[PDB]
Each structure stands twice: as C-alpha cells, then as structure tokens.
C-alpha cells in the first residue's frame, strides 16, 4: 500500500515522441507527482499553466492527470495554447478555450533532427474543418480540394493530407523540432489518486 512517484520520466524522457497529428496521451493515476521539480527544470524553456500557478499544483489532488506529448517545429510552439489558430491548433492538436492545465516545451534538435531529414515526424496540412479540443485525427484519406471525387488517388485537387517535417540539424530554431508535453487535470465524483508532495 505504498504510493510511488508518477512515471513522468516515461513521458518527458521517451526515446521517440509521437507525430503531432497522432499525438500520444498517457493517463496518469495512483501516484504522487512533484510538479515544482518539473517547473524548476531549466531546459523547459516553455512552461506555462492557465488559471493556476505552477507552484500551487503540488497542493492539489486530482482523479487523473493526462500527459499529451508530440513534436512540432519551433515557430509552432505558440499554437499549443488556448485560443490559438493555425495549421497545428486547427488541424493537429487543439486545446479548449477554457483550458486550465499546463504546456511544456523544449528544443529537441539533438534527439529528433537527422542528417538527411527526419521525415517520420509529420503533421496534417489539409483538413476540411477544425479539430475539436483534444481530438486526434489519424486518417490518411486523400483530401478532396475540388468538386471531383478522388477515389483514393492523388492528383489535381486530390492531395495526401499529411506532410513530413524532415527535421535537419542545420535548420534554425524556428524549424527545429520541439518536444511538447501538455498536462490536463481531471476532477470527477471519485477519490483523487494523483496528489502533490
């Protein structure tokens, strides 16, 4: 009946991250979490919480915590926030307007950029409508951009919806990969299983 530390190491220090269009979610429960330790970790150049101060998180208990993680390029980090628009916020990973969690991001050029490009990190370029908050769309159907059906064949007005980042070490920080972790806190009519120290 011993309470263990939450496995944040498995999220923040995973060898590879998911593509943003297929963003990973880790459900965290029945453990003790030290959020102030994460907050004071200097390599987290982006650490932002909404409606709550990051040092208050250690005083709170929740039913579950969700850790979403993925990779985007540097100049898209600002889209991982409530009320944002753009290709990532609209078509890949959407936060709700009333979000009250935290967003963490750090440069991952050394891990995710590859000589010759890392084309395995992808994002959705074409989509007909915006994602709902916390929606994950992994469809690879040919995108119909005209009045004629595509029938699964790319061509005029018929495009593959996913595009590769192709991360390379020689890109500037705006186009280098950044690993992102989004923490959401869930409160239900149930005993809380995740508390701070």
């Amino acid at each position, epitope marked *: 009946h011993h309470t263990n530390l939450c496995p944040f190491d498995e999220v923040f220090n995973a060898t590879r991250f998911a593509s943003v269009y297929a963003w990973n979610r880790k459900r965290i429960s029945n453990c003790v979490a030290d959020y102030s330790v994460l*907050y004071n970790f200097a390599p987290f*150049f*982006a*650490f*932002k*919480c*909404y*409606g*709550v*101060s*990051p*040092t*208050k998180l250690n005083d709170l208990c929740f039913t579950n915590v969700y850790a979403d993680s993925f990779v985007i390029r*540097g*100049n898209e*980090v*600002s889209q991982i*926030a409530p009320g944002q628009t753009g290709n990532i916020a609209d078509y890949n990973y959407k936060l709700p307007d009333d979000f009250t969690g*935290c*967003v963490i*991001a750090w440069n991952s050029n050394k891990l995710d950029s590859k000589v010759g490009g890392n084309y395995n990190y992808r994002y959705r370029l074409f989509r007909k409508s915006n994602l709902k908050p916390f929606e994950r769309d992994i469809s690879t159907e040919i995108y119909q951009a005209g009045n004629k059906p595509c029938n699964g064949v790319a061509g005029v007005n018929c495009y593959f919806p996913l595009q590769s980042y192709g991360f390379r070490p020689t890109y500037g920080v705006g186009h280098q990969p950044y690993r992102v972790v989004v923490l959401s806190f869930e409160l239900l009519h149930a005993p809380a299983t995740v508390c701070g120290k």
Partner: nanobody, 124 residues
C-alpha cells in the same frame, strides 16, 4: 484593456547600471506573466528575463544570470529589471511583454501584449 508602460532606458558606460520598469494594467487576475525581450540592430528579438506574477518566480538567460534581477512591486503593479555590470553586447531595444499564462516562454509569438520598447546603449 491590457496596457504596458515602460521607462528607464538610456545610455551607460561598460560596467554601469540601469533599471527598467514595466507598469502592467488591465489584467483580471494574477495568472499572467511578464517578460523582457531585447532586439539588437540586426538580430532577432530574444527574451532575457521572465517573471511569473502569481508564483513570483523569476527566470534569466545564462548571459545575464548574475547581472540582471527581475522583480515586482505589488503596490504600483510594476515589474522592474535591474541591469548591473552592463556590457556593450547588452545594447538593444528592450521590450516589456505580457503573456496570458502563469510561467515562461522564449518565443516572442507566445506573448500577446507588447510595450513600445526602450533603448539601452552601452558605450563600447
């Protein structure tokens, strides 16, 4: 109705001190954050110091760590950046920026509110 008013720039010799101030008003709670960005004549805008208001946590880039101090006076809603041991490399336009979040971010595009900027010059 967020407004950022800055002051305190000027000219200094290498090794001198200078204090910048940013009076932030219009926020509806304390869960916002203040950052100081600077922009050299031919370079990009880069943050040098951050203060999350609610938790009162300061953050500094490594090139200013033992020279700059960011703090807030709650009475006049003003965030101060004390810059000591100024170097010629510190010459730039310094901007106060405000973000609708508790914490920090290095990307200028993550901050929705910007002051007019104040000129800081260190004499060779």
């Amino acid at each position: 109705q967020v407004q950022l008013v800055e002051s305190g720039g000027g000219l200094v010799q290498p090794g001198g001190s200078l204090r910048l101030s940013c009076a932030a008003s219009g926020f509806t709670n304390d869960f916002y954050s203040i950052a100081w960005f600077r922009q050299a004549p031919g370079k990009e805008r880069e943050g040098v110091s951050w203060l999350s208001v609610s938790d009162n946590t300061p953050t500094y880039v490594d090139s200013v760590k033992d020279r700059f101090t960011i703090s807030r006076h709650n009475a006049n809603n003003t965030v101060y950046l004390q810059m000591n041991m100024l170097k010629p490399e510190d010459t730039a336009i310094y901007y106060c920026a405000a973000g609708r979040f508790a914490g920090r971010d290095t990307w200028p595009s993550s901050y929705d509110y910007w002051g007019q900027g104040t000129q800081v010059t260190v004499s060779s």
